[PDB]
Swiss-Prot record, chain A:
Optimum pH is 3.4. Stability declines sharply below pH 2.8 and above pH 5.0. Its main location: secreted. The lineage of its organism: Eukaryota, Fungi, Dikarya, Ascomycota, Pezizomycotina. One of its GO terms (molecular function) is cellulase activity. This is Xyloglucan-specific endo-beta-1,4-glucanase A.
Length: 218, 404
């Protein structure tokens, strides 16, 4: 049982699974998402898609999103996360990233967006001022590349893996703690969003098989 | 009473003009109209296929004839003349022409909005507009019957609706690159909502003063100002680095030369040779600085480039941004690659800024492509322009309005 609508959704345990085809108007094609297994803080799912056109423009952000209360960084002890996935299909240009947001109120529009890219396929890349790394940190047993750029009234910070990580496990809080210590993000800001998903631009007979995914806030 | 209004817009593929749809005439017909942001009025082709029972000629020396901006009176047909016939001069700006035109009233009907979806239909029984000959449709998108003027007059859509329905004299407009789905313009008040859940309001947009060119480029009235929309660029930055230009050209003079205006008639942003050279050179210079290489110049573009190290981002291709720095140093119209670049095919990306010769009336003209996927709000009452930035940054597009 899947869904193929631009705004079709599904609730499973701690999560809402979003087809969210926000840029379907920029290209030509199809995308269908569905739940495979869920229990509590863990989920499994898949999105098959083929997009052509708009090599620049993202067609969708199919993501599983945790349902939680906005919480201050200085209250977070740990955000344990496990993510195992696989991608089939040809000419895949797309990413697979954790995606989060920090506001100063638990409601106001966002001030920082922090992403952790488990994969950058076929050309996909983060927002950047210079195009160059601002740091190459080693965090949660992975060597990352950190980039940074403006988005409206929001600094976007993206951690990209040096190589494609089909299996990942660790404390996602670390990425915040590092930004707070090294990039001057206020420990008082509220964590409002925690999403793990994939944004494709173009590809053929694709399928992102997320074999297990689990995340919590302690 | 509606708070606001919403019309669809869509990009015609042959011409690259933005095309909208209103309802006019009794019985109502759907009219496709080219959007001319600067235009002075709605003008529609009034030939023998204009059949309506609610059409009325506007007489000269009437209240509605003064409002129109009609400087003259009366008409001479051919084989004799007519005393006072409220003549005006509807303009096709794509072909730099003006024919003569007769003011008239007829019913116009569009959709109301609460700013998030399509509301109940509302109506202006006697909407003031201009007739015109079929010839003024030269080189306009197929299917269209006239031109939607959004300029700064009493009888142009935004102030005339504002006046008709008694809401704030302002309109936002959200252009798209899709020939596929509907884009929208929204007349009336904020906040504009774009699916899934992206709210855009006056608290959210960036504001620069809206400047008035005291002499008209619109060069058909003596000592009559331009009804167009100019904003105050102080410098251009290409990834944090100021490009060496003549800053005198940026400023509107005594004679009305130079400065920056926004338009929907120009599909790509027209740059005067002096600014064009500097912007293009520096853009190439910086693009090579992140290993993005130059390829043959495809028409109609100056610079074009390989997609070999062109990374795809949410904000477009990974090219330097062009920041137009406005009245302060912290107020900037940022232009990412989705707004600067133009895909020719899979392997080539061109810069979407064209050269406009020298001795052009306006130094910088911000064009259609550079407006695409930005919410751009024009407040005529308080004389300002507010802008969202690339809506792709918030993961929405100008085609995400819940239109029906």
């Amino acid at each position: 049982s899947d869904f193929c609508g631009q705004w079709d959704t599904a609730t499973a345990g701690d999560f809402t699974l979003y087809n969210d085809l926000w840029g379907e108007s920029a290209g030509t094609g199809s995308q269908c998402t569905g739940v495979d297994s869920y229990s509590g803080d863990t989920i499994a799912w898949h999105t098959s898609w083929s997009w052509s056109g708009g090599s620049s423009s993202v067609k969708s952000y199919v993501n599983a999103a945790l349902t939680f209360t906005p919480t201050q960084l200085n209250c977070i002890s740990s955000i344990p996360t496990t993510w195992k996935w696989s991608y089939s299909g040809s000419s895949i240009v797309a990413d697979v990233a954790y995606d989060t947001f920090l506001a100063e109120t638990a409601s106001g529009s966002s001030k920082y967006e922090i992403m952790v890219w488990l994969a950058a396929l076929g050309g996909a890349g983060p927002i950047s001022s210079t195009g160059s790394t601002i740091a190459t940190p080693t965090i949660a047993g992975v060597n990352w590349k950190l980039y940074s750029g403006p988005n409206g009234d929001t600094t976007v910070y993206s951690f990209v893996a040096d190589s494609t990580t089909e299996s990942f496990s660790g404390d996602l809080n670390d990425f915040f703690t590092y930004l707070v210590d090294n990039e001057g993000v206020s420990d008082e800001l509220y964590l409002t969003t925690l999403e793990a998903g994939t944004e494709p631009f173009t590809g053929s007979n694709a399928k992102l098989t997320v074999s297990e995914y689990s995340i919590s806030i302690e | 009473r509606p708070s606001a209004l919403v019309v669809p817009v869509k990009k015609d593929a042959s011409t690259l003009q933005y095309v909208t749809t209103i309802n006019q005439r009794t019985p109502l017909v759907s009219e496709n109209l080219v959007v001319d942001l600067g235009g002075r009025f709605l003008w529609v082709d009034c030939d023998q296929n204009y059949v309506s029972s609610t059409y009325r000629p506007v007489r000269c020396r009437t209240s509605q004839c003064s409002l129109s901006g009609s400087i003259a009176c009366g008409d001479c047909f051919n084989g004799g003349c007519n005393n006072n016939t409220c003549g005006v001069f509807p303009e096709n700006p794509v072909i730099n022409t003006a024919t003569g035109g007769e003011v008239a009233e007829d019913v116009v009907s569009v959709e109301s909005t609460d700013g998030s979806s399509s509301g109940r239909v509302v109506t202006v029984p006697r909407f003031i507009f201009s007739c015109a000959p079929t010839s003024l449709l030269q080189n306009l998108a197929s299917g269209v019957v006239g031109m939607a003027g959004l300029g700064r007059t009493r009888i142009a859509l935004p102030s005339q609706f504002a006046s008709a329905f008694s809401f704030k004299r302002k309109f936002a407009m959200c252009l798209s690159g899709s020939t596929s789905s509907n884009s929208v313009i929204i007349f009336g008040n904020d906040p504009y909502t774009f699916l899934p859940n992206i709210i855009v309001s006056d608290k959210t947009l960036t504001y620069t003063p809206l400047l008035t060119n005291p002499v008209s480029t619109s060069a058909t009235t003596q000592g009559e100002p331009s009804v167009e929309y100019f904003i105050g660029v102080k410098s251009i930055k290409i990834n944090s680095k100021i490009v060496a230009l003549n800053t005198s050209l940026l400023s509107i003079s005594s004679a009305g030369l130079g400065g920056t205006k926004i338009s929907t008639i120009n599909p790509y942003t027209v740059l005067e040779t002096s600014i064009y050279k500097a912007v293009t050179e520096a853009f190439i210079k910086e693009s090579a600085a992140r290993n993005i290489t130059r390829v043959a110049s495809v028409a109609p573009f100056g610079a074009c480039f390989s997609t070999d190290n062109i990374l795809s981002t949410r904000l477009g291709p990974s090219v330097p941004s062009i920041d137009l720095v406005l009245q302060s140093e912290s107020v900037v119209w940022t232009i990412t690659g989705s707004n600067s670049m133009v895909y020719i095919n899979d392997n080539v990306v061109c810069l979407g800024v064209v050269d406009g010769g020298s001795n052009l009336r306006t130094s910088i003209v911000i064009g259609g492509h550079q407006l695409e996927d930005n919410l751009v709000q024009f407040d005529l009452a308080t004389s300002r322009v507010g802008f969202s930035g690339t809506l792709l940054g918030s993961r929405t597009t100008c085609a995400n309005f819940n239109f029906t």
